[PDB]
C-alpha cells in the first residue's frame, strides 16, 4: 500500500478540496422525520445517505443505481459508511486565527513575525489598530496605535498608509511579508553584533523561516479563511432509549460557529455599526477557538450541562484521547478473563481453561471444523449446534484446542513475562488454572486476582506463541540470568 | 467473561458493548510486553484484525471458516478517525508515496 | 505436543526466522497445496512444521528451492 506520511498547513483551496459542500445552517434533523436537514451539520446532499444505497427522497431507491446523483434531493446513492468519511467546509465571513499556532508555547504566528504575543492578542480584540504596508511614511510596516491615534493618523495620509484592526490585519501581515527578504537581512544582523539575545532570536527565527520555506507552506494559512468540518457519523446524533437522543458536543460547537458566522454575514448585509461588527468578529474568533482547542479561552460551558464540551483537540490529546485509548491500546476480540486457581497437577507448559470460555472463544474455528468434517450442513447449522451445546462438539473442541496455544496475562503487566503462552487444558468450572511456578513471574497471588486470556488467530501468531512466548521457552529472567520458575513456598 | 465476535462501538469501531464484552483492553503495557518478545504478527492481528478493522474482522472470519489462516490487515479504524479529526483542523495531513 | 522448541532454534539460528520459515511451511500445509514430510501424529500444521524443522529437512533454502522449481514447472505448463 502506502509509504511515509506528510503533515503541513492546509490551504483554503485544499480545505475545499476535501470538502464537497458548504454547511449553511445550524440545523441537524427535521425533528419529526429524523432525516437530515439539507444542508446542515447532518446533511444527505453534502455527506451522504442515512440508509445504505437509498436517496433521501427515494426516487432513485434501487441498489443497482450506483454512482447516480439524484435530482429531487441531490443525494448520491452509496453505502452509509461514506457518511463517516466525507468532509464539509464553512466559508468564514471575517478571517480567523488558528488558536493552535497562536497559543502554542513558542507562538508560531507571534515568533514568525518577530512580535510579542500580548500585542497580537490586543490587536485581535480590536483594542488597538496596526499598520500594514506604509511605503514611505513615518512608521514601519508593523506598529500599534490606539483609537485616538488612528483618529488623527489617517488625516496625515489618507492613502499610502494602510492600517486595519483584528484578524484581517494579522492575515495582511502574514501575506505582505515574503520571508526571503526578512532572512537575507537577519543574515547580516546575526553576523555582526554578539549579544546572546541576538543569536538566540536569530537561531530560533532563522531556523523557523528556512525550514518553513523549504516545505512550501505559506504563512497566511495560519489564519483560517475556510473551516473544515468533521463527518457527521464521527459526531453522531443516533437515537437512544426512551426517545432521547445522544450527540457529541462537537455538534453544539459547530452549531455556534455556523450561527455566529451567518449572523456576521447578516450584520454585514445590514450595514451595522463598527462596535457591533467588531463584537461579532471577536465572538466568532472565540467560537472557532473553542472548537479547535477548548481551554486556552473562556472554556465555553455546555448546554444545561455544567461540564465543558469535548472539542477536537480534546478528542485527540490526553490519556483518554484517540492516541492513548485507541491507537496504542485497544480492546480485542477473541478474548476473555476470569478469576484464577491453582491446578498443581499441570505440567509447566499448560493451564486450566474452563469449558464455556473456550467454547465462546473458539466459535469460528469450531464452526469451520464442524462444517469441514460434515457434521454441520452450513454455518448457520453449526451455530445452532453450539447454541444447543450438542455432545458431539466437545470432541471437535478437543481437536481444535490440542495444538492451539493461548495467551495469559495479569493486570499489573511490568515485564514481558507478564504475558505467557500455555497449552489449553479443558476444565469443568469457571476458573482459570495457572501453573504455580509461573505465579512468581506474574506476581499473581491467589487472593482474588483475575487474569485474561487471548487466542492467537493466524498461523504466525500461533508459531510466535509456541516458539517465543511459551512458558517453557521463558525460564531465565531478561533483567538477570536468575531463573523465574523458582519454587515459591 | 468471554467473547469471540460481538457488537462494536459506533464512534470508533471497538468491541465494547452489551453484560461486559470486549477483551481486557490491550493497553500500552501489554503492547510493550509483546514488543519485548519477537512476536510482531501477534501484535498486528491484535490491534488490526481482531479489534479495529471493520473490513479485516469479517474478511478474517471468512478465511477462518474456509480453513485458510491469513489476513488482509488494512488500516485500523481509530487511525482513520484520527486522520479525519486532524484534517478537521487547519492541518493538512496526507499519505505520501506508493 | 512440542514442549520445547530448543532443537529447532539449534538447527536454524536466529530463533525468529524459525518462526517465519515454519509459518511459511504451515501455510504450504494448511492451505492444501502440500503435505507433511514427517508422520502426522494428529498434530496441527504448527507442530508438524516444527518437527520438520527439528529433523533438519526444512529451512528457508529448501523451501525456496522447492518454490523456484515449482516456478519452472508452471513455466513448463505453458506447453
Amino acid at each position: 500500500e502506502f509509504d511515509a506520511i506528510k503533515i503541513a498547513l492546509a490551504s483554503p483551496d485544499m480545505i475545499r478540496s476535501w470538502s464537497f459542500g458548504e454547511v449553511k445552517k445550524p440545523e441537524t434533523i427535521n425533528y419529526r422525520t429524523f432525516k437530515p436537514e439539507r444542508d446542515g451539520l447532518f446533511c444527505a446532499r453534502i455527506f451522504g445517505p442515512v440508509k445504505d444505497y437509498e436517496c433521501l427522497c427515494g426516487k432513485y431507491k434501487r441498489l443497482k443505481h450506483r454512482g447516480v446523483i439524484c435530482e429531487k434531493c441531490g443525494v448520491e446513492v452509496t453505502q452509509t459508511k461514506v457518511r463517516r468519511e466525507r468532509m464539509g467546509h464553512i466559508e468564514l465571513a471575517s478571517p480567523t486565527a488558528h488558536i493552535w499556532f497562536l497559543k502554542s508555547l513558542p507562538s508560531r504566528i507571534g515568533l514568525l513575525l518577530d512580535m510579542p504575543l500580548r500585542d497580537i492578542e490586543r490587536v485581535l480584540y480590536f483594542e488597538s489598530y496596526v499598520v500594514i504596508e506604509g511605503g514611505m511614511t513615518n512608521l514601519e510596516r508593523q506598529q500599534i496605535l490606539t483609537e485616538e491615534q488612528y483618529l488623527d493618523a489617517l488625516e496625515e495620509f489618507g492613502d499610502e498608509f494602510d492600517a486595519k484592526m483584528g484578524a484581517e490585519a494579522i492575515q495582511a501581515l502574514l501575506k505582505s511579508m515574503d520571508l526571503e527578504q526578512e532572512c537575507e537581512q537577519l543574515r547580516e544582523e546575526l553576523n555582526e553584533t554578539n549579544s546572546e539575545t541576538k543569536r538566540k532570536k536569530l537561531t530560533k527565527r532563522i531556523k523557523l523561516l528556512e525550514a518553513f520555506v523549504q516545505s512550501g507552506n505559506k504563512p497566511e494559512w495560519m489564519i483560517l479563511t475556510v473551516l473544515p468540518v468533521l463527518p457527521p457519523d464521527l459526531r453522531p446524533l443516533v437515537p437512544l432509549d426512551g426517545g432521547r437522543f445522544a450527540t457529541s458536543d462537537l455538534n453544539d460547537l459547530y452549531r455556534r460557529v455556523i450561527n455566529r458566522n451567518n449572523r456576521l454575514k447578516r450584520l454585514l448585509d445590514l450595514a451595522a455599526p463598527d462596535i457591533i461588527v467588531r463584537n461579532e468578529k471577536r465572538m466568532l474568533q472565540e467560537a472557532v477557538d473553542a472548537l479547535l482547542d477548548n481551554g486556552r479561552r473562556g472554556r465555553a460551558i455546555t448546554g444545561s450541562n455544567k461540564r465543558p464540551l469535548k472539542s477536537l483537540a480534546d478528542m485527540i490529546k490526553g490519556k483518554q484521547g484517540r492516541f492513548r485509548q485507541n491507537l496504542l491500546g485497544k480492546r480485542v476480540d477473541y478474548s476473555g478473563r476470569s478469576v484464577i486457581t491453582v491446578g498443581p497437577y499441570l505440567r509447566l507448559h499448560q493451564c486450566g481453561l474452563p469449558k464455556k470460555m473456550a467454547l465462546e472463544l473458539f466459535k469460528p474455528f469450531i464452526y469451520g471444523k464442524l462444517e469441514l468434517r460434515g457434521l454441520a450442513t452450513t454455518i448457520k447449522a453449526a451455530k445452532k449446534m453450539v447454541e444447543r451445546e450438542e455432545a458431539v462438539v466437545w470432541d471437535i473442541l478437543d481437536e481444535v484446542i490440542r495444538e492451539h496455544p493461548v495467551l495469559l496475562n495479569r493486570a499489573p503487566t511490568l515485564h514481558r513475562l507478564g504475558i505467557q503462552a500455555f497449552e489449553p487444558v479443558l476444565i469443568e468450572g469457571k476458573a482459570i488454572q495457572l501453573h504455580p511456578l509461573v505465579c512468581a513471574a506474574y506476581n499473581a497471588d491467589f487472593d482474588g486476582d483475575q487474569m485474561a486470556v487471548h487466542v492467537p488467530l493466524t498461523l504466525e501468531a500461533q508459531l510466535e506463541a509456541r516458539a517465543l512466548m511459551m512458558s517453557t521457552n521463558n525460564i531465565l529472567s531478561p533483567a538477570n540470568g536468575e531463573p523465574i520458575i523458582v519454587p515459591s513456598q | 467473561h468471554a467473547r469471540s465476535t460481538g457488537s462494536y462501538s459506533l464512534v470508533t469501531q471497538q468491541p465494547l458493548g452489551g453484560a461486559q464484552f470486549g477483551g481486557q483492553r490491550f493497553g500500552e503495557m501489554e503492547v510493550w510486553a509483546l514488543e519485548a518478545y519477537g512476536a510482531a504478527y501477534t501484535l498486528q492481528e491484535m490491534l488490526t484484525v481482531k479489534s479495529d478493522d471493520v473490513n479485516g474482522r469479517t474478511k478474517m472470519y471468512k478465511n477462518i471458516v474456509d480453513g485458510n489462516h491469513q489476513m488482509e490487515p488494512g488500516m485500523p479504524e481509530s487511525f482513520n478517525v484520527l486522520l479525519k479529526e486532524i484534517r478537521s483542523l487547519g492541518i493538512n495531513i496526507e499519505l505520501e508515496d506508493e | 505436543a512440542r514442549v520445547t522448541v530448543q532443537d529447532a532454534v539449534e538447527k536454524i539460528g536466529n530463533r525468529f526466522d524459525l518462526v517465519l520459515v515454519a509459518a511459511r511451511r504451515a501455510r504450504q500445509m494448511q492451505v492444501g497445496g502440500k503435505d507433511p514430510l514427517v508422520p502426522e501424529e494428529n498434530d496441527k500444521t504448527t507442530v508438524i512444521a516444527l518437527r520438520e524443522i527439528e529433523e533438519g529437512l526444512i529451512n528457508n533454502q529448501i523451501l525456496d528451492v522447492r518454490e523456484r522449481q515449482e516456478q519452472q514447472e508452471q513455466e513448463a505448463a505453458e506447453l
Binding site: - | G38, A39, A40, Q44 | F16, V19, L20
Partner: peptide, 13 residues
C-alpha cells in the same frame, strides 16, 4: 521481531 526480516527486505528495497 519477525517483521524485521520482512522489514529488512523492504528497507533495503
Amino acid at each position: 521481531g519477525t517483521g524485521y526480516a520482512y522489514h529488512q527486505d523492504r528497507m533495503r528495497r
